[PDB]
Design an enzyme around this catalytic site. Structure first.
Site, PDB file in Angstrom:
ATOM      1  NE  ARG A 109      59.773  50.385  52.817  1.00  0.00           N
ATOM      2  CZ  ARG A 109      59.996  50.952  51.619  1.00  0.00           C
ATOM      3  NH1 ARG A 109      59.019  50.847  50.702  1.00  0.00           N
ATOM      4  NH2 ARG A 109      61.124  51.608  51.365  1.00  0.00           N
ATOM      5  NE  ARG A 169      54.578  57.123  56.693  1.00  0.00           N
ATOM      6  CZ  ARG A 169      55.108  55.938  56.588  1.00  0.00           C
ATOM      7  NH1 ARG A 169      55.408  55.323  57.742  1.00  0.00           N
ATOM      8  NH2 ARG A 169      55.370  55.187  55.558  1.00  0.00           N
ATOM      9  CG  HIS A 200      54.322  50.206  43.426  1.00  0.00           C
ATOM     10  ND1 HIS A 200      54.039  51.495  43.005  1.00  0.00           N
ATOM     11  CD2 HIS A 200      55.610  49.976  43.144  1.00  0.00           C
ATOM     12  CE1 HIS A 200      55.147  52.037  42.445  1.00  0.00           C
ATOM     13  NE2 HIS A 200      56.074  51.109  42.473  1.00  0.00           N
ATOM     14  CG  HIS A 201      56.003  45.581  40.138  1.00  0.00           C
ATOM     15  ND1 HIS A 201      56.362  46.194  39.004  1.00  0.00           N
ATOM     16  CD2 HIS A 201      56.466  44.260  40.076  1.00  0.00           C
ATOM     17  CE1 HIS A 201      57.109  45.363  38.233  1.00  0.00           C
ATOM     18  NE2 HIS A 201      57.128  44.185  38.824  1.00  0.00           N
ATOM     19  CG  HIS A 210      54.206  52.973  48.401  1.00  0.00           C
ATOM     20  ND1 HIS A 210      55.533  53.265  48.245  1.00  0.00           N
ATOM     21  CD2 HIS A 210      53.697  53.976  49.164  1.00  0.00           C
ATOM     22  CE1 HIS A 210      55.841  54.372  48.909  1.00  0.00           C
ATOM     23  NE2 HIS A 210      54.726  54.824  49.401  1.00  0.00           N
ATOM     24  NE  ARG A 238      58.872  47.349  42.034  1.00  0.00           N
ATOM     25  CZ  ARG A 238      59.328  48.520  42.463  1.00  0.00           C
ATOM     26  NH1 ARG A 238      60.210  49.131  41.666  1.00  0.00           N
ATOM     27  NH2 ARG A 238      58.945  49.033  43.626  1.00  0.00           N
ATOM     28  CD  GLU A 262      60.200  54.426  53.592  1.00  0.00           C
ATOM     29  OE1 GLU A 262      59.274  53.577  53.758  1.00  0.00           O
ATOM     30  OE2 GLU A 262      61.349  54.038  53.388  1.00  0.00           O
TER      31      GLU A 262
HETATM   32  C1  LIG Z   1      54.368  55.187  39.876  1.00  0.00           C
HETATM   33  C2  LIG Z   1      55.355  54.100  39.593  1.00  0.00           C
HETATM   34  C3  LIG Z   1      56.712  54.315  39.579  1.00  0.00           C
HETATM   35  C4  LIG Z   1      57.574  53.245  39.302  1.00  0.00           C
HETATM   36  N1  LIG Z   1      58.905  53.491  39.288  1.00  0.00           N
HETATM   37  C5  LIG Z   1      59.784  52.514  39.014  1.00  0.00           C
HETATM   38  C6  LIG Z   1      61.210  52.815  38.916  1.00  0.00           C
HETATM   39  O1  LIG Z   1      61.598  53.928  39.134  1.00  0.00           O
HETATM   40  N2  LIG Z   1      62.140  51.803  38.701  1.00  0.00           N
HETATM   41  C7  LIG Z   1      61.592  50.499  38.508  1.00  0.00           C
HETATM   42  O2  LIG Z   1      62.469  49.721  38.319  1.00  0.00           O
HETATM   43  N3  LIG Z   1      60.307  50.268  38.544  1.00  0.00           N
HETATM   44  C8  LIG Z   1      59.348  51.179  38.729  1.00  0.00           C
HETATM   45  N4  LIG Z   1      58.029  50.932  38.716  1.00  0.00           N
HETATM   46  C9  LIG Z   1      57.617  49.670  38.024  1.00  0.00           C
HETATM   47  C10 LIG Z   1      57.990  49.755  36.505  1.00  0.00           C
HETATM   48  O3  LIG Z   1      57.635  51.147  36.204  1.00  0.00           O
HETATM   49  C11 LIG Z   1      56.910  48.922  35.772  1.00  0.00           C
HETATM   50  O4  LIG Z   1      56.932  47.559  36.217  1.00  0.00           O
HETATM   51  C12 LIG Z   1      57.442  48.688  34.318  1.00  0.00           C
HETATM   52  O5  LIG Z   1      57.423  50.024  33.729  1.00  0.00           O
HETATM   53  C13 LIG Z   1      56.339  47.839  33.591  1.00  0.00           C
HETATM   54  O6  LIG Z   1      56.718  47.998  32.083  1.00  0.00           O
HETATM   55  P1  LIG Z   1      55.996  47.215  30.970  1.00  0.00           P
HETATM   56  O7  LIG Z   1      56.703  47.631  29.701  1.00  0.00           O
HETATM   57  O8  LIG Z   1      56.030  45.895  31.418  1.00  0.00           O
HETATM   58  O9  LIG Z   1      54.616  47.634  31.108  1.00  0.00           O
HETATM   59  P2  LIG Z   1      53.785  49.023  31.063  1.00  0.00           P
HETATM   60  O10 LIG Z   1      54.730  50.183  31.013  1.00  0.00           O
HETATM   61  O11 LIG Z   1      52.686  49.053  31.855  1.00  0.00           O
HETATM   62  O12 LIG Z   1      53.077  49.143  29.665  1.00  0.00           O
HETATM   63  C14 LIG Z   1      52.165  48.100  29.126  1.00  0.00           C
HETATM   64  C15 LIG Z   1      51.468  48.694  27.802  1.00  0.00           C
HETATM   65  O13 LIG Z   1      50.578  47.561  27.348  1.00  0.00           O
HETATM   66  C16 LIG Z   1      49.270  48.175  27.012  1.00  0.00           C
HETATM   67  N5  LIG Z   1      48.368  47.016  27.038  1.00  0.00           N
HETATM   68  C17 LIG Z   1      47.889  46.328  28.125  1.00  0.00           C
HETATM   69  N6  LIG Z   1      47.011  45.423  27.790  1.00  0.00           N
HETATM   70  C18 LIG Z   1      46.895  45.501  26.406  1.00  0.00           C
HETATM   71  C19 LIG Z   1      46.028  44.833  25.438  1.00  0.00           C
HETATM   72  N7  LIG Z   1      45.161  43.909  25.749  1.00  0.00           N
HETATM   73  N8  LIG Z   1      46.249  45.193  24.149  1.00  0.00           N
HETATM   74  C20 LIG Z   1      47.088  46.218  23.776  1.00  0.00           C
HETATM   75  N9  LIG Z   1      47.907  46.899  24.608  1.00  0.00           N
HETATM   76  C21 LIG Z   1      47.730  46.503  25.897  1.00  0.00           C
HETATM   77  C22 LIG Z   1      49.038  49.122  28.129  1.00  0.00           C
HETATM   78  O14 LIG Z   1      47.936  49.975  27.735  1.00  0.00           O
HETATM   79  C23 LIG Z   1      50.445  49.823  28.157  1.00  0.00           C
HETATM   80  O15 LIG Z   1      50.612  51.063  27.632  1.00  0.00           O
HETATM   81  C24 LIG Z   1      57.067  51.928  38.976  1.00  0.00           C
HETATM   82  C25 LIG Z   1      55.705  51.741  38.978  1.00  0.00           C
HETATM   83  C26 LIG Z   1      54.864  52.781  39.279  1.00  0.00           C
HETATM   84  C27 LIG Z   1      53.385  52.551  39.220  1.00  0.00           C
END
Ligand SMILES: Cc1cc2nc3c(=O)[nH]c(=O)nc-3n(C[C@H](O)[C@H](O)[C@H](O)COP(=O)(O)OP(=O)(O)OC[C@H]3O[C@@H](n4cnc5c(N)ncnc54)[C@H](O)[C@@H]3O)c2cc1C
Ligand SMILES: Cc1cc2nc3c(=O)[nH]c(=O)nc-3n(C[C@H](O)[C@H](O)[C@H](O)COP(=O)(O)OP(=O)(O)OC[C@H]3O[C@@H](n4cnc5c(N)ncnc54)[C@H](O)[C@@H]3O)c2cc1C
Ligand code: HEM
Ligand code: HEM
Ligand code: HEM
Ligand code: HEM
Ligand code: HEM
Ligand code: HEM
Ligand code: HEM
Ligand code: HEM
Lengths: 564, 564
Positions: free
Chosen positions: B396, B375, B498-499, B359, B538, B372
Site C-alpha cells: 500500500r 486490484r 484517513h486517520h 489509504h 491504527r 485494494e
Molecule cells: C470512512 C471511514 C471509515 C472508518 N471505519 C472504521 C472502522 O470500521 N473501525 C475503526 O475502528 N475505525 C474506523 N475509522 C476511524 C474511526 O471511524 C474514527 O477514528 C472514530 O470514529 C473517531 O471518533 P471520534 O468520536 O473521535 O470522532 P468523530 O466521530 O469524528 O466525531 C467528532 C465530532 O466532534 C465535532 N467537533 C469537532 N470540532 C468541534 C468543535 N470545535 N466544537 C464542537 N464540535 C466539534 C465534529 O463536528 C464531530 O461530529 C474510519 C474512518 C473513516 C474516515
C-alpha cells in the site's frame, strides 16, 4: 566611504588580503591567514588588561573576520549572546549590509539541482558541532572522503558553550574517585529522567559506548578528569576538564584541532538548504548556500545531519509549543532547526518532535543561564515593580509559568552582600556585567526601574519572614539569609528555550527513518537534530555524550555505506 | 427574488417556521419541528422508486435544514462526500452565503470570556461522534449534568461513516462462533500494529474493556452480531451489525437515540473555539461560536474533548506530514483538528502528534475507499494519460507513493465487464455513480481524459501480459482478467488521509496532560482527538473501540470530578 579593505589597500593593495584575481572562498581562509601573518596569532594579540578580551575567549581560535569585516560594518560577535558594554570597534563607520544568509532562494536551489553535482564526496557532514566533528572524524578513520560544512562564521554550535561535561559509565576517572556504577543504572537513570519515553535501544547504546567515548576524546587530547554528580544521576559520572576549561570549549577545541590534523576541511559560512533525492528515495547530495560562492550541489553517497536543535526557530517553537513562544533562549543563534526541516520535507519521520526543554531563569539582557542554586542559597525573586509572586524554591516548571505571568514576562533575582560573598557564580555574573547594583534598596529600585514603595515593602516582609522563619506571603520553604548587608544586587531573567529533545527519527546505527520507520537510503544523523535519546527530558551530561557516541556511530555507518 | 422562507411566509407567515419574536436557536430546533409537522418525518417523505433518497440515507434522522435552507442557496449535503448528479434542489436561486463558521473572532472570544459564563453545567462534552456521545451518556449515568455540543449540522462526525466494526476480546459473539481469543493477543496485535509505540497502558485498558463496550452498545439496542477478521488481528475480533446497517450508522443511530432518551440533547451548529483557563491553570469552560447566537461562554467544572482527528486540516497535515499534503481524505469535513489546536494553545502536551495514516486509493470525486481487492481481483491502474506505472499488487505504501508521483497526483482503476460481473463491490461503486464507462476502450479514454493511443496501447500490452502470465512492464505476478469485454470502466482515485493517530496526551483516566505530563484540572479527552492508543499505526476496528472504551472513561471521570 572608508573601508577596512580600503584602509589596508591604501597602504598596500588588494592582494595583501586577497588572491591575485580576487576570489574569496566561503571559509575566507586566505584572507584570515593574512591577518594572522601581519598581526600575529591571538596569543600575540591577547591583552589581560582588557576586561573581556575579544582576542582571548572561550570561543577559541576562530576567524578574525567573524568580527572584523573587509567591507562592511564590524560585528562584535560576543554580544550575540552577551551584553558587553563596548566602545565602537575600529572601522565601525563602514557600510551596513544584511547578513549573507537570507533564507532559502528556491529558484537558485532548483538551478543548482538541475546543473547537477558541482563536486563529489563520499560523506558530507552537515554541521560542525560536537556531533558533526565526531561524525567527520569517525568517517575519515574508516577510509571515506569527507566534506564538513557549517553555516556559521566559526565552528561549535551549542556544543562549544556547554558547561556540565559528559556522562559516562565504566571509566578510569570513576575508579579513581571510588565510585561504583553499572551500565544498567545509567540506562535506568536516563529512562527515568525522560519519563520513560526514551528509546531504550538508543539509551542502551549511549550508556554502553560512553566510557569509550571519553577515552576517544582523551585520545585526541582532551582532559575530562573532573568527575562529578548531576541532577537525575544516582552516582557520579559527569566528566569535566581538570582545572581549565568548561567542557564545551575543551571538547570543541580538541575536535577542531583533531579535524585540522586529519585534513578534514570544514567549510564555514556554508548552509545546506536542501537534501537532494533521486527517483528511488535516496539522498544523493545536498544543495549548499555558500556565502561567497553562492548555490551549488555536492553529490555524496552519504549525508549525515549534525545540525543541532531548533531552540531558536521561532516558527517551530510557536507551532510545537505555543506557550513557550515569548521565551528567550540560552542557545547559540545557529540552532534554527534546518536539519529537521530538510529531513521533514523529503519525508523523514520524527521522534518526540514537539518536546522542548526550557530553563526558568535565563538572563534577559544577556542570554546566560542563571543557576537555580542562586535562588537556593537565599536569593529572592521579584517582578518588574519589585513584588514577589511565588516561592523561589518552586519547580523549574512553575517558576517559568509564574514568570511569564508577570509584567513584561521577566523577573529580578535579588540578593544582598551575604549572598554575594557566599556564592561565586553570582560574582561570575557580576564579572560578566550582569548585575544591577544599588547601595540602598531604594537605589536598587530606581536603577532596575522597579517601584521603590513595593520593593521597600518586599524586603521588610522578606526580612520579617526570614526573622519569623514563616513565609506567609508565598510560602517560601526556607530562607537561609536575609537582605541587609549593603550593596544590593539585581539580575534580569526570564524563562528560556534550552534544548529540543525531539528531532529526526533514527535507528541504532544512526540512519534517519522514513514514514514506514525504515532507513532512508543515504541519510544519517546524530546529536540534538535527532529525537529519542532523551525522551521527554534531557539530563545534564547526556546531550554531549549523545553527540559523541552517535556522532561516531553516524560517521562510521556513513562511510561504510559510501564504501561497501 | 424569493427564498424558501418567503415562499412559505407568503402562504402562511414568518411564524410558519419561526417562534414569535424571531429568535432562531443554534440547533434550529423549532424550525425543523415545523418542517416535520407540515411535511411529515423521513419515513413518510421516503420514496423507494428513487436512486439516492435524500430522505432515507445512512445519515439517519437529521435536521431538514442540513440541506433545505430558509434564506440561502440549499446544500445537497450528500455531495460533501459523494458526487451524485442531481437536478437543482427546490429554491436553488436563493442567495449564496458563506458558511456561518468563518474561523475564530479573537475580539469576540475575548468579550465572551471578559463577560464570564452565560450558563453553567457540570460536564461540557465537545463533539458528538462516538467518543462524545459515549462520554455524555457515562457522565449522565454518573449523575452529572451535561451539555453536548457539535459544530456540524447533524451529529456523528467520522464515526457515522465507519465501515469495519469494533474490535473486542472475550465476547459472546466470539463464543458463539468457536473463536478463542485472549486479552494478551489483542494487546500484542495492537502493539505490533502500532510498531511498538503505543502506550501499553492505554492498549491494556482498550483490550480489557472492549467486550464491556460492545455489551454497553448492545444494552442501548445496537446489533453487533457479525464476527469477522481484520488486518493485523490474529483471530476474528471485529463486531459489525448482523445484516441491516453498516457499523458506523448503527452505532451513531444507537447513541443518538440513547442520548435523546436520557435527555441529553446535542446543541448543533455550535463550534467550541477556546478553552477558558482560570488563574490556577484550571479549565473552567469554553467559548462557543453558535451559528445564530454568536459567541458565548459556558462555565463547566469538566470539559471533555471528543472532537475527532485532524485529517481535513490542510495546514496541520502540511506541517506534520508535508509529503502527504496532496492526498485527498476519506473523512467527514468536521475533522479539522480543533480539539488538538485548543488543547495545544493552553499548554496541553501531545502524543505521537505527527503520525498520520492514509489509504492508497480513495475516490477523488466520491471520497470513499476503493478497496485494494478491486486490484486483487483483476483491475489495472493507469495514470491520467492511460499508462500503468507500477504493479497493481504492490504494497500500500508503494502504491500511494507512486500515485503521488503521477501527473495530477491521482490514478484511474480500470476493468472490463468480466470484473464488473464478478464483483458486486464495484457494482456498488457504479450505483454511487463513481464509475466512468465506455462501450469501447477509446470511448472510456475520451470520457476520462486519457490519451486514446496510450490507453489502447496499455490494454493490448496488458492483455498480452495476461495471455503469457508475465508482465514485462511491472512484474505483477497474477493477472486474472484482461480487458476485452464491453463496457469498460474506470474510477478516479488518490491516496487519502484517513486517520490521525497522534493527538492530545492522555493518562489512563483520560485526563489531558500538561507539559509535565500531569493532568490538567478540568480537562478530559477521548477518541481520535487523543494520541497514544494506536502508536504509529491504527488497526481496523480499534479506533471505534477506542471511542467507546475511553469515551466512557472520559465521561465517567469528567462526572466524578464535577461532583466529588
Ligand atoms: C470512512 C471511514 C471509515 C472508518 N471505519 C472504521 C472502522 O470500521 N473501525 C475503526 O475502528 N475505525 C474506523 N475509522 C476511524 C474511526 O471511524 C474514527 O477514528 C472514530 O470514529 C473517531 O471518533 P471520534 O468520536 O473521535 O470522532 P468523530 O466521530 O469524528 O466525531 C467528532 C465530532 O466532534 C465535532 N467537533 C469537532 N470540532 C468541534 C468543535 N470545535 N466544537 C464542537 N464540535 C466539534 C465534529 O463536528 C464531530 O461530529 C474510519 C474512518 C473513516 C474516515
Ligand atoms: C548554554 C548551554 C549549556 C549546555 N550545557 C550542557 C551540558 O552541560 N551537558 C549536556 O549534555 N548538554 C548541554 N547542553 C545541550 C548540548 O550542549 C547540546 O544539545 C549539544 O551540544 C548540541 O550538539 P550538536 O552537535 O548536535 O549540535 P550543535 O553543537 O548545536 O552544533 C550544530 C552545528 O550545525 C551548524 N548547522 C546548522 N544548520 C546548518 C545548515 N543548514 N548547514 C550547515 N551547517 C548547519 C550550526 O551552525 C552548528 O555549528 C547545553 C546547551 C546550551 C545552550
Ligand atoms: C582581515 C584581515 C585583517 C584584519 C581584520 C585586520 C585588523 C586590523 C584593525 C582592526 C586595524 C586597526 C586597529 C586600530 O584601530 O588600531 C588594523 C590596522 C592595521 N593593519 Fe590590519 N588587519 C588585517 C590584515 C592586515 C594585513 C594583511 C596587514 C599587512 C599587510 C595589516 C597591517 C595593518 C597595519 C600596519 C595596521 C595599522 C597598525 C598599527 O600601526 O597599529 N593588517 N588592522
Ligand atoms: C587573530 C585574529 C584577529 C586579529 C589579527 C585582529 C586584529 C585586531 C587588531 C590589530 C586590533 C587593534 C589593535 C592594534 O592596534 O594592533 C583589534 C581590535 C579589536 N578586535 Fe580584533 N582581531 C582578530 C580577531 C577578533 C575577534 C575574533 C574578535 C571578537 C570575537 C575581535 C574583536 C575586536 C575588538 C572588539 C577590537 C577593539 C578592542 C579594543 O577596544 O581593544 N577581533 N583586532
Ligand atoms: C581595492 C581593494 C579590494 C578589493 C577590490 C576587494 C574586493 C573584494 C570582493 C569583490 C569581495 C567579495 C564579495 C563576495 O564574494 O560576495 C571581498 C571580500 C572581502 N575582502 Fe576585500 N577587497 C579589497 C581589499 C581588501 C583588504 C585590504 C582587506 C583586508 C583588510 C579585505 C578583506 C576582505 C574581507 C574580510 C572580505 C569578506 C568581507 C567582508 O566581510 O566585508 N579586502 N573583497
Ligand atoms: C570573543 C567573544 C566572547 C567573549 C570575550 C566572551 C566572554 C565570556 C566570559 C569572560 C565568560 C565567563 C567565563 C567562562 O565561563 O568562560 C563567558 C561565559 C559564557 N559565554 Fe561568552 N564570550 C564571548 C562570546 C560568547 C558567545 C558567541 C556565546 C554563545 C554562542 C557565549 C556564551 C557564553 C556562555 C553560555 C557562558 C557561560 C555562562 C555561565 O555558565 O556562567 N559567549 N563568556
Ligand atoms: C418573511 C419571513 C421571515 C423572516 C423575516 C425570517 C427571518 C429570519 C432570520 C432573521 C433568521 C436568522 C439568521 C441569522 O442568524 O443570521 C432566519 C433564519 C432561518 N429561517 Fe427565517 N424568516 C422568515 C420566514 C421563514 C420561514 C417561513 C422559514 C421556513 C420555511 C424560515 C426558515 C429559516 C431557517 C431554516 C433559518 C436558519 C438559516 C437558514 O436556513 O437560512 N424562515 N430567518
Ligand atoms: C424549514 C422547514 C421546511 C422545509 C425544509 C420545507 C420544505 C419545503 C419544500 C422543499 C417545498 C417545495 C417542494 C417542491 O418544490 O416540490 C415546500 C413547499 C411547501 N411547504 Fe414546506 N417546508 C418547511 C416548513 C413548512 C411548514 C411549517 C409548512 C406549513 C405551515 C409547510 C408547507 C408547505 C406547503 C403547503 C408547500 C407547497 C406544497 C404544495 O402545495 O404542493 N412547509 N416545503
Ligand atoms: C424531514 C426532513 C425534510 C423535509 C420535510 C424535506 C422536504 C422536502 C420536500 C417537501 C421536497 C419536495 C418534494 C417532496 O415533497 O418530496 C424535498 C425535496 C428534496 N429534499 Fe428534502 N426534506 C427534508 C430533509 C432533506 C435533507 C436532510 C436533504 C439532503 C440530504 C434533502 C434534500 C432534498 C432534495 C435533493 C430534494 C429534491 C428531490 C426531488 O427531486 O424531489 N431534504 N424535500
Ligand atoms: C443524504 C445524504 C447521502 C446519501 C443519500 C448517501 C448515499 C449513500 C449510499 C446509497 C451509500 C451505499 C450504501 C451504504 O454503504 O450505506 C453510501 C455510502 C457511503 N457514504 Fe453516503 N450518502 C449520503 C451522505 C454522505 C456523507 C455526508 C458522507 C461523509 C460524511 C458519506 C460517506 C459515505 C461512505 C464513506 C460510504 C461507504 C461507501 C462504501 O464503502 O462503499 N455519505 N452513501
Amino acid at each position: 566611504t572608508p573601508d577596512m579593505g580600503s584602509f589596508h589597500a591604501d597602504m598596500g593593495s588588494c592582494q595583501s588580503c586577497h588572491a591575485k584575481p580576487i576570489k574569496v572562498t566561503d571559509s575566507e581562509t586566505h584572507e584570515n591567514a593574512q591577518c594572522k601573518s601581519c598581526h600575529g596569532e591571538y596569543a600575540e594579540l591577547a591583552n589581560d588588561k582588557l576586561q573581556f578580551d575579544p582576542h582571548n575567549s572561550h570561543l577559541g581560535d576562530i576567524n578574525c573576520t567573524s568580527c572584523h569585516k573587509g567591507h562592511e560594518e564590524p560585528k562584535f560577535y560576543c554580544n550575540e549572546c552577551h551584553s558587553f558594554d563596548i566602545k565602537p570597534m575600529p572601522f565601525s563607520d563602514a557600510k551596513k549590509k544584511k547578513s549573507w544568509d537570507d533564507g532559502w532562494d528556491q529558484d537558485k536551489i532548483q538551478k543548482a539541482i538541475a546543473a547537477g553535482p558541482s563536486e563529489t564526496t563520499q560523506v558530507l557532514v552537515v554541521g560542525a558541532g560536537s556531533a558533526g566533528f565526531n561524525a567527520s572524524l569517525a568517517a575519515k578513520k574508516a577510509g571515506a572522503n569527507v566534506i564538513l560544512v557549517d553555516k556559521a562564521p566559526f565552528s561549535g554550535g551549542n556544543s562549544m558553550i556547554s558547561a556540565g561535561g559528559m556522562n559516562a559509565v565504566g571509566t578510569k576517572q570513576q575508579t579513581a574517585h571510588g565510585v561504583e556504577d553499572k551500565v544498567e543504572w545509567f540506562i535506568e537513570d536516563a529512562m527515568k529522567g525522560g519519563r520513560q519515553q526514551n528509546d531504550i535501544k538508543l539509551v542502551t547504546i549511549l550508556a554502553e559506548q560512553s566510557a569509550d567515548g571519553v577515552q576517544w576524546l582523551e585520545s585526541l587530547g582532551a582532559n575530562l578528569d573532573d568527575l562529578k554528580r548531576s541532577g537525575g544521576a544516582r552516582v557520579d559520572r559527569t566528566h569535566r576538564p581538570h582545572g581549565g576549561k568548561s567542557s564545551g570549549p575543551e571538547i570543541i577545541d580538541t575536535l577542531r584541532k583533531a579535524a585540522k590534523e586529519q585534513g578534514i576541511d570544514t567549510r564555514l559560512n556554508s548552509r545546506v538548504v536542501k537534501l537532494v533525492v533521486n527517483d528511488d528515495h535516496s539522498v544523493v547530495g545536498a544543495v549548499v548556500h555558500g556565502k561567497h560562492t553562492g548555490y551549488y550541489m555536492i553529490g555524496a553517497k552519504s549525508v549525515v545531519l549534525a545540525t543541532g536543535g531548533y531552540g531558536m526557530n521561532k516558527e517551530m517553537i510557536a507551532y510545537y509549543r505555543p506557550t513557550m513562544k515569548d521565551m528567550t533562549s540560552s542557545n547559540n543563534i545557529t540552532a534554527t532547526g534546518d536539519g529537521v526541516l530538510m529531513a521533514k520535507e523529503i519525508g523523514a519521520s520524527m521522534t518526540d518532535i514537539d518536546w522542548v526543554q526550557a530553563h526558568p531563569t535565563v538572563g534577559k539582557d544577556s542570554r546566560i543561564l542563571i543557576s537555580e542554586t542562586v535562588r537556593g542559597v537565599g536569593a529572592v525573586m521579584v517582578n518588574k515593580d519589585g513584588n514577589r509572586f511565588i516561592s523561589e524554591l518552586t519547580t523549574r516548571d512553575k517558576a517559568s509559568d509564574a514568570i511569564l505571568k508577570q509584567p513584561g514576562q521577566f523577573a529580578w533575582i535579588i540578593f544582598d552582600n551575604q549572598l554575594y560573598k557566599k556564592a561565586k557564580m553570582v560574582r561570575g555574573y557580576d564579572h560578566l556585567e550582569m548585575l544591577y547594583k544599588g547601595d540602598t534598596v531604594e537605589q536598587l529600585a530606581k536603577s532596575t526601574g522597579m517601584k521603590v514603595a513595593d520593593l521597600a515593602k518586599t524586603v521588610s516582609d522578606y526580612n520579617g519572614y526570614v526573622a519569623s522563619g514563616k513565609d506567609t506571603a508565598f510560602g517560601r520553604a526556607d530562607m537561609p539569609l536575609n537582605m541587609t548587608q549593603s550593596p544590593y544586587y539585581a539580575v534580569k531573567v526570564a524563562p528560556g528555550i534550552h534544548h529540543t529533545m525531539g528531532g529526526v527519527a533514527i535507528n541504532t546505527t544512526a540512519s534517519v527513518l522514513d514514514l514506514q520507520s525504515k532507513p532512508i537510503d543515504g541519510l544519517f544523523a546524530a546529536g540534538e537534530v535527532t529525537g529519542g535519546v532523551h525522551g521527554y527530558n534531557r539530563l545534564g551530561g547526556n546531550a554531549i555524550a549523545d553527540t559523541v557516541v552517535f556522532g561516531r556511530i553516524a560517521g562510521d555507518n556513513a562511510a561504510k555505506h559510501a564504501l561497501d
